[model samples]
Target: TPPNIVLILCDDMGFSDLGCYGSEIQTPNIDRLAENGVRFSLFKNTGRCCPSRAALLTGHYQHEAGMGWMTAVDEHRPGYRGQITKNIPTIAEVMKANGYSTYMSGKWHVTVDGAFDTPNGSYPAQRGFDKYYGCLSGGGSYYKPTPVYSNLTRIKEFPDDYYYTTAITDSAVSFVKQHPTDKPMFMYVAHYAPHLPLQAPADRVEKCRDRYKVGYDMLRKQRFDRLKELKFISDEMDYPVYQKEFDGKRPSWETLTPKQQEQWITDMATYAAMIEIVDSGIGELVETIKEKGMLDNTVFIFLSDNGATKEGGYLGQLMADLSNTPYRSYKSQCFQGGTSTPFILSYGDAEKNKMKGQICRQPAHIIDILPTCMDIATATYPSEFKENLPGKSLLPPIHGKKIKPRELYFEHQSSCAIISNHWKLVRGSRNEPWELIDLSADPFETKDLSAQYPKLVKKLEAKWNKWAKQCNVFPLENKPWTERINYYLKQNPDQSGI
Candidate 1:
């Protein structure tokens, strides 16, 4: 029998926030999964929401698969060039094509800007999802979401006390229970929780309120220390300099007033509470699978879209605490903290704690997920399903087999980074110069060795340039399609060639 797949994905969760990952935050359910499954120590993300999803779903680099940035807004045209691009096959498309029932619940952000309308051509039905239930926009009020739908069907707006995270979990459980008995199931539970607005239930909020009464500076310091103790980073590493202005114009956390500090902590505490609430839901889902006698035949995977997000807009307040501890830069940048994430996989007898408690240190990324799923399902990626998909199966890594090391690439909102073996070259913004780091020695990215090793920098830069060329990354001078279609047209003169 084919294994039932349950992919529980969180949005903008911090690397050190989970208990098993060395956070003080209590995530017992997830910790239990980690104790009974394989934990990947070097999992990477595409560094943003939409692009991360595009990479995971299509099994290709974000820019190459399209959905480069959030939405195809004009200023972000080339990478964001609206829609999922007809060239990539989504997880749903592959699973459904393989005869498994596919279902999705949560944020679906891979399209042009349109709310709940099928005319947008990016809704779940238009995509590969057999059934989709959730919000249409990038984000909305968690307490009361104005959800959009395909085929003119509008899901009744969530009630005043409705929470998106909990709702998504509930919907996922329902979808799993409703699956037909004759076929295996593929369910994607993409929770839009702990992302922003920091709305959480009162009970959950209270659980973490006084726990972080100290300031963010102290909390960040403590988390960093804990990370060192866990051996996730080197003890000799120095704290990364807090960005004075993220994305070139946002304020730093030190700029906030005392009262503002309290509010920010309260907001973050609520975010942590929301994550716990999701964990409870996950526990319930796992229990349900066991109760239904499908536990041993199920493959459960969990990961976050990206590292902790610092996109709190003008109020960059308290986000330093949300960052992947000890690593520099936040969401929208090319830093290790921005793109790194926790990846957990529990499957078959592995979920029973017999073969699960192992941690794999090999580097992997969101783009590797589809290929891994294909391998486990004993399915193959069809050439006609999507064009130019470039990904390899991660089964060898999961099964303890030695394989050739693979280089990973990342791009979001024009910031770019490339990882080859132990070395990495990252740039925070388009105008900034790249900084090279030997990740094997400086996992937290504290030391910038660009000046110390000019030859190494040049070699890594050349490597990035080569990969960028192959992936069709635009030059720094090119304008986004939103600003001028003619500009993009001129870059690639062959209209039919694309």
Candidate 2:
């Protein structure tokens, strides 16, 4: 009676990677959805994969949901169990309880690598999904992603030409076909494309070549100009391009050997091609849902889990620019470039749904997903849920309702921030000093106001410190977060794990 829900999430995508978000990539499928539905301008992620997914699936902070860090390794701090706990009810569980069918297809990276072998509480089916099909690990090769599962068992063997995106897409459509036409279903498609190992099939790579040869500087500028031209954003009030700082990053684009430059072009082009392939999968999904006559009643929510990654030592090319366009730093940092995301709620045929094609400039985070799903499903959490779920239903902004200004807090591996009103107090890592910025002047954190606004910084930092404790966020390892980042994240992210 309410609406069938479809939540689509991308892995390691940037704020401007979507066509509607001003990327040069071909994403007409998603752009068409944004053309009719609502797009979020200030949507934020937890800045890391495991924590983001934990907070997203449960309406709690990542630590509160039992993942303060990643699934690959265990440091075992208070909240760093690296697994989703049974104590917190997932969105799928809540939806199922509300009499909605729950389906999941793609990466379920909230649990440790041994989850599939051990009787771990974090597997997809264990958590509440009635049907599950995807990798148990965080990332893998697009060509041969292994340890993939169906419900709970490992799925061995595929077509000789299997691609990760296509298989997952087929699984999603198949799940839809299995359900009765009239049943209310909640489907989550966690796509693992454009993430790492930057591999794209030959056909998808054709269109994305040559242009990246101009490099990351031109890429950011082009997207920034298009943002203004499209009128989706303005050059004022918290939004504007900042000067580049290579600062021990890769040598200048001009300084690179011709072969180095050419290799970067191919790698980046492959990344773009990977995204385009994912976009085509979305297009196929639209056609399938339309053919099933479910488009009118389905509400589609889409967002990337985190910003583009720069871990691959391509600092000159990928780190300083390319991925996290118009933002300060790449993935793994607390900067907007690492945490900001492009969020969309596309309910087909906006006129019928009483929705408009507009961009919402409110602050939002991954923790809001559960509340939003619950809001649409008319579901309620158990008595244990009191003041714990620190998220508001997005249905407010989605359909012309007002939400109070956000006072959001973020901390991943001790890189942290607390945004209150238009002011932000942030640090690159636990070892860094707090920097204050009037978000009105620079959304990408261009200048430091902590010196000028010491009192305000002190107040905000204290508040954040208190929140970190309240959420059970523990101190990261004694070493720097960057050290932790580099220790685990090699340039060529391994498809070799799990």
Candidate 3:
């Protein structure tokens, strides 16, 4: 009876994709939420899809949730099982136990690939959602998506005018109308738009069709300036920066031929279109909640699962390098470009005004989401659960002053990092040695202090090793972690995030 909670997550978006986050893309709905509530500038994800989902839902490292890798490739390890271990509970599970009506509509890639349609234990319905709708895989065609589920059934396709974004919104609204208005509910709107397959309506794609003419470099600069104005990049902290790439340096926008430039720009236009459609859905969703007179009390949180992605190989991903703007790297890597995401928590300025329209530059992770939600929902874990939670509630951080600094860890594809306050130690890939950066002074990660602070790096490395082992991600195998997790992903691949 506290308030209706809506957890809205967008797929594969850059940190700067939203208007509020300094992107050229028009995300008015998300911007409105940011203007009304709190925005976290330094929030991060698990650097990939399933890992993020596992961490966000369980309030623990993805490995502890049995998702060291994606559900599509379940290696024979506890961490790589690719599903939330049964003993642990999802945020939905905890909320449902507290008597909250739970509804989930969107991607559910937490279970094995085959488990989606069958009597698998990892389905949303079985994982704490009472009413489940949406897809079971990671990416699909918007117009003709496959395996779109309605509770236990599958929706093969949609009407000619159907868009995945709008369909999911419709499902949400329908559930709202069918349920009691005053009943407290936990609704998870996990959108798979803007991820891959690069499809959107003509009008939506045209909304920002002219911007690409200005090119990726110009766009990156614009976003950086906006972040400076927004105060996420302070005078003391360095401004947005372009990072080095694994495939090769991003080609200068001016260097592209007229025809090649047009084609590449068009590709980005399609991605922009995908994101805006999801934004429009947000507008529709909030309006529906308002109509029920529930707007005043409903709490909405908008976030992306991870950094922007290329959807293809490294060379192809370069076309959208600036999608992450100031961040470094791509979705598959462990850099800020892969792990950082824009996070907005809105309680409506008209309601309680807790940190209304404020910017919270705290370093939080996806694993921190469940604790925040449970604390807000006044929900408690089941008595049988005894594992110590790795995250703390965000209420105190958002409602009060500065959140106490904490050490956050990341590991994906054998690329790893650890941030303790403003200092960070990162390993570029499995073969690379550790590199250190003082994020406060070098936000772009342009400088490596590993040589200067060899002792410090060792200390941090030891600490990180201990944590990783405890979390079930140690034992640096000969093959990269990505290879291990992705070993079977290609035969059939799926991604999901909480």
Task: Give the alpha carbon lDDT tens digit for every residue of 408-471 in model 1.
Answer: 8876656778898898988876777788888988876667888998998888788887877766
Angstrom error of the Cα, residue 77, model 2: value is 3.7
Is 1 or 3 the stronger prediction by TM-score? 3
Q: Estimate, for each residue in 1-498, the C-alpha lDDT of model 3 and write its tens digit.
A: 677889998888888888998888988999999998999988989888998988888888988888876766666565777677777888888888888899998877787765655646778887889999888787667776667778877676578798777888889888776767757889999998778877888887787689878977788778888888887787555554453564444577787789877877778888888888888888888888888888887898999888888665542466446777677877867788888899998884366657777888778888888988888888778777885889877778787767789899988867889999898898867798888999888777788998899899999999888889998896544354467556555533443311
Model 2, range 99-145, lDDT digits (tens) per residue? 78899999889877645564355789888899999887787798878
Q: How many residue pairs clash (N, CA or C atoms closer than 3 angstroms) in each of the candidate models, in the order given?
A: 3, 3, 1
Candidate 1: worst-modelled 10 consecutive residues by lDDT? 489-498
Clashes of 1: 3
TM-score of 2: 0.92
lDDT of each: 0.73, 0.79, 0.80
- RMSD for each of the candidates: 4.2, 3.9, 3.0
> What is the TM-score of each predicted model, taking all chains together?
0.88, 0.92, 0.94
Candidate 1: clashing pairs of residues: 74-482, 116-148, 116-149
